[PDB]
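_Full entry_
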Amino acid sequence: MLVLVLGDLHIPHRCNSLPAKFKKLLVPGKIQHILCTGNLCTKESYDYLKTLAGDVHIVRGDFDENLNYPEQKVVTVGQFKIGLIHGHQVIPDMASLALLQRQFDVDILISGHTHKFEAFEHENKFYINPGSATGAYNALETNIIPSFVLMDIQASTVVTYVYQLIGDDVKVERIEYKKP
C-alpha cells in the first residue's frame, strides 16, 4: 500500500505552496497513509494532507503552530514499525540517526529538518528523509530542491520513490529495502 512521506513545507512563512507539478501528482484515492515530519506550519497545510488521505500522522517540527503534536511517534504499516521525528533534535549526522533508530527500535526511521532528502540502508535498518516538499530555505543551506517520498509497503518489502523537482521536471529515484 501507498504511504506518502513529506514535511518541512513552511507554508506560509517561507513558501506559499507546493510546486504545481507536485500538486498535479498528489490526488485523493491513491494514498493510504501519510507520515509527515512536521513544519507545516499551519492548519491550511494539515487540511490539504487530509484531502489526500484520511490517515494522517504528523510530528511536531520546531516551527509548528499546532502544539498538540507529539515530538516522536512509531507507526506500524504491514510488517514495518516506522519511527517518525522532525529531527531538529539530532545534535548534528549518521551516528545520531542510528542512536534514534535504536532508541525507537524501528525498521525504518523517518526524519526531516535538513531540507535534503535521504533514503539509504545502514546496519540493515532503513532511513528516509523526504526533504522539503516546497523546497523551503533552511538557515544558510544551499542547493535546496523540493522533494517528497512515496513508499509502497507490502509484506516484508518496501520500495521507496523520491520525487524531486529538478529544474522544471519531476525526477524519481527508487530504493529498495527488505526487512532482513
